[PDB]
Design a protein around this ligand. Structure first.
Ligand SMILES: [Zn+2]
Length: 188
C-alpha cells in the first residue's frame, strides 16, 4: 500500500509552518524542505483549536515517485552502520529535544515512523515546534539514491485515528540554500 498524503486540516484546523534553521529552509512554492544531514529541522504545528491531551504527532517518509511509492524509505546501509540509543539505526527521521519520542515500525508494511505527544504552543509562540533530524542524504546510493521523498505529519488520537494530515517534500543535501534556489529557478 501507499500511505495517504492527502492534506486534511480536520476539525482542529491543523496546518504546518516552517522556520529557517543554513541547516534547514522551506520553499512554499515547492512545498519542499531542504536540510542538512543530522541538523535541526524545525516544523511548526498550527491549529485553530487545541487538540485534547493524548493527541499524538507522527512523522513518516515515503517515496514521491510512483515507481518506488510502495517501497519503505530507510537509511542506506552505510548510514545504518554509522544512534542516541533511542532511534533504531534504520530510521531516517529522528526527533531531537524531546524526552517522549516513540520509534515505531508498522507490523504489516514495515514502514518506520516517529511519534511524539502533541503539546500546545510554548510562551512567545502561536504554534508548536518539533525538531526533526534526517539521518541520510537524498543522494545516498542504496538508500534514497536521489529519489525525492515526502514527510507526512499526522495528528492522531491515542488509538491511532486520524485527526489531521499534511505533508512536505524533503531533500537532505550539503547546501540547502543553494539547492532551494536551483530548484525554484527551474520553476520560472
Ligand atoms: Zn545514507
Amino acid at each position: 500500500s501507499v500511505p495517504s498524503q492527502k492534506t486534511y486540516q480536520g476539525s482542529y484546523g491543523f496546518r504546518l509552518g516552517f522556520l529557517h534553521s543554513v541547516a534547514c529552509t522551506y520553499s512554499p512554492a515547492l512545498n519542499k524542505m531542504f536540510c542538512q544531514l543530522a541538523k535541526t529541522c524545525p516544523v511548526q504545528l498550527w491549529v485553530d483549536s487545541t487538540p485534547p491531551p493524548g493527541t499524538r504527532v507522527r512523522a513518516m517518509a515515503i517515496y514521491k515517485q510512483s515507481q518506488r511509492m510502495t517501497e519503505v524509505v530507510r537509511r542506506c546501509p552505510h548510514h545504518e552502520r554509522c544512534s542516541d540509543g533511542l532511534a533504531p539505526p534504520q530510521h531516517l527521521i529522528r526527533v531531537e529535544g524531546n524526552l517522549r519520542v516513540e520509534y515505531l515500525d508498522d507490523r504489516n508494511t514495515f514502514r518506520h515512523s516517529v511519534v511524539v505527544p502533541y503539546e500546545p504552543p510554548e510562551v512567545g509562540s502561536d504554534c508548536t515546534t518539533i525538531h526533526y533530524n534526517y539521518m541520510c542524504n537524498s543522494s545516498c546510493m542504496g538508500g534514497m539514491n536521489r529519489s525525492p521523498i515526502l514527510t507526512i505529519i499526522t495528528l492522531e488520537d491515542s488509538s491511532g485515528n486520524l485527526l489531521g494530515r499534511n505533508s512536505f517534500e524533503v531533500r537532505v543535501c550539503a547546501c540547502p540554500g543553494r539547492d532551494r534556489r536551483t530548484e525554484e529557478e527551474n520553476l520560472r
